[PDB]
C-alpha cells in the first residue's frame, strides 16, 4: 500500500528543499523495497531488514531527494561535508535505511539540465532534520551531461526513518 509511489515518482525535489512524506495506519510491506538488485547502497543503520516486520512504527517517514554520485557517502551518521552540513543532516543515533539508486536515463539530459540545486553558503550549520528553503546567492546547479564521471551522476537517494508512539 504506502510507498509504491515514492520509489517510482517521476520528479524528485532537490536536496536544498527535500520533501518528507509520513505514512500512518497503512500496511507495512517492507519486502518489495529489499531483495531488489537495482539499488546501489542499501545501508540500514539501527534495525535490520528481514526482521523489519514488527508493526509498532507509527508515522514512518520517507525523505527523498537527489544528490550527485559520490556524495551519497555523506548520508551516513556523522560524516561532515557540504550535504550533511548545510542541506540535509541525519542524527547521530539514526535508525533508518538510506537507499540510493542510479539515474542514467531519467535525470541526465543530453544538454545537461540545471533544474537541481544544492545550498553552498549558510551560517549556523544544521541540526538533525532541518530544512531551510530560504534564498538570500547560496544555491548552485549541477549540470548532468551523460558523459560525466560515474561519481558525478545523480543518485536518487531516499531515506526511511522510523519512530514509535
Amino acid at each position, epitope marked *: 500500500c504506502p510507498f509504491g509511489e515514492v520509489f517510482n515518482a517521476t520528479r524528485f525535489a532537490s536536496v536544498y528543499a527535500w520533501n518528507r512524506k509520513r505514512i500512518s495506519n497503512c500496511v507495512a510491506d517492507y519486502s518489495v523495497l*529489499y*531483495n531488489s538488485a537495482s539499488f546501489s547502497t*542499501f*545501508k*540500514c*543503520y539501527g534495525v*535490520s*531488514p*528481514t*526482521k523489519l516486520n514488527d508493526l509498532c512504527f507509527t508515522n514512518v517517514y520517507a525523505d527523498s531527494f537527489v544528490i550527485r554520485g*559520490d*556524495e551519497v*557517502r*555523506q548520508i*551516513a*551518521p*556523522g*560524516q*561532515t*561535508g*557540504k550535504i550533511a*552540513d548545510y542541506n540535509y543532516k541525519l542524527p*547521530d*543515533d539514526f535508525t533508518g535505511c538510506v537507499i540510493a539508486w542510479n539515474s542514467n536515463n531519467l535525470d541526465s539530459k543530453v544538454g545537461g539540465n540545471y533544474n537541481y540545486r544544492y545550498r553552498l553558503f549558510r551560517k549556523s*550549520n544544521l541540526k538533525p532534520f532541518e530544512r531551510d528553503i530560504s534564498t538570500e546567492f547560496p544555491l548552485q546547479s549541477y549540470g548532468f551531461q551523460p558523459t560525466n*564521471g*560515474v*561519481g558525478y551522476q545523480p543518485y536518487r537517494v531516499v531515506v526511511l526513518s522510523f519512530e514509535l508512539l
Partner: antibody, heavy 131, light 111 residues
C-alpha cells in the same frame, strides 16, 4: 570537545610484553568501530587492527597477524591493543583512529562499513623495542 | 613495501596546481572501494582531508579536490599557500587481504 587520549608506550625488552590503551571522550564510543594504525619512524603508515561495533568482528594486517590482539572496553569507553613477542621492525608510533559509525546491512547480515576512512586521530603513543 | 604505488616526492612553485597521483590495483580500487586522502604535517598525527574520492569535510578549503576513474585516483591542490608542506597518504580498502591499505606517502613542499 572530541579528543582521543592515549597512554601505554615506552621502552620494552623484546619478548616481555606491553599493552596499549586509547581513551575516548566527546562522542559515543559504543556505536562506532575503532582502528589501530602504526608508523615506523620515517616510513609510511600501516594498518594494524580493527574491532567492530560490539566486539564480534575482527580483522588484522599481515605483519601483526598473530602477535597483536585488539580488545575494547565499552564500560569506561577505552580501546586496548595487546601486543606480545615484539620484533626489530615493530619500533613505531601507534595511532588509534575513530572508524565509521556504519553498521550497515542488507538481507540481515550485520557487517562493518568498508568505504569510509578514519575521521579523528589522537596524538598516539610511541614504542621503542631493542635488545 | 606498500600496496598502493604513488610517487615518492613531487613539488611545485607557489600559485600553481599540483596533482599528487595515486594508482592502485585491480583488487582494491578496481573492485570499487573509495580512495580517501590524508594530510600529515611533519610532527603531527594525520587528519582526514578528502573521503569518498571527492567529498571534503568542514575545515578543509575548496582547494583540495579529488578524482577516481578506473584504477587511478589523484588529489589536486589549486593555488597552494606556504602552509601546505605536509605529507599526503591515499587510503583505500583491499578485498584480497581484507584490510585497509595505504600509500607510500608523497613529500610535498613549496618552491
Amino acid at each position: 570537545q572530541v579528543q582521543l587520549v592515549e597512554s601505554g608506550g615506552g621502552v620494552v625488552q623484546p619478548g616481555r610484553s606491553l599493552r596499549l590503551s586509547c581513551a575516548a571522550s566527546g562522542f559515543t564510543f559504543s556505536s562506532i568501530a575503532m582502528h589501530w594504525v602504526r608508523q615506523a619512524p620515517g616510513k609510511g603508515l600501516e594498518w594494524v587492527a580493527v574491532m567492530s561495533f560490539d566486539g564480534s568482528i575482527k580483522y588484522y594486517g599481515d605483519s601483526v597477524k598473530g602477535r597483536f590482539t585488539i580488545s575494547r572496553d565499552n564500560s569506561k569507553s577505552t580501546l586496548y591493543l595487546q601486543m606480545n613477542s615484539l620484533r626489530a621492525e615493530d619500533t613505531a608510533v601507534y595511532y588509534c583512529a575513530r572508524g565509521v559509525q556504519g553498521y550497515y546491512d542488507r538481507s540481515g547480515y550485520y557487517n562493518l562499513d568498508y568505504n569510509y576512512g578514519m575521521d579523528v586521530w589522537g596524538q598516539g603513543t610511541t614504542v621503542t623495542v631493542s635488545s | 613495501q606498500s600496496v598502493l604505488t604513488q610517487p615518492p616526492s613531487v613539488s611545485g612553485a607557489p600559485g600553481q596546481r599540483v596533482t599528487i597521483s595515486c594508482t592502485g590495483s585491480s583488487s582494491n580500487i578496481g573492485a570499487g572501494y573509495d580512495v580517501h586522502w590524508y594530510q600529515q604535517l611533519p610532527g603531527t598525527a594525520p587528519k582526514l582531508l578528502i573521503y569518498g574520492n571527492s567529498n571534503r569535510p568542514s575545515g578543509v578549503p575548496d582547494r583540495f579536490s579529488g578524482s577516481k576513474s578506473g584504477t587511478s585516483a589523484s588529489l589536486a591542490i589549486t593555488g597552494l599557500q606556504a602552509e601546505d608542506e605536509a605529507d599526503y597518504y591515499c587510503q583505500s580498502y583491499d578485498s584480497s587481504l581484507s584490510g585497509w591499505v595505504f600509500g607510500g606517502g608523497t613529500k610535498l613542499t613549496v618552491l
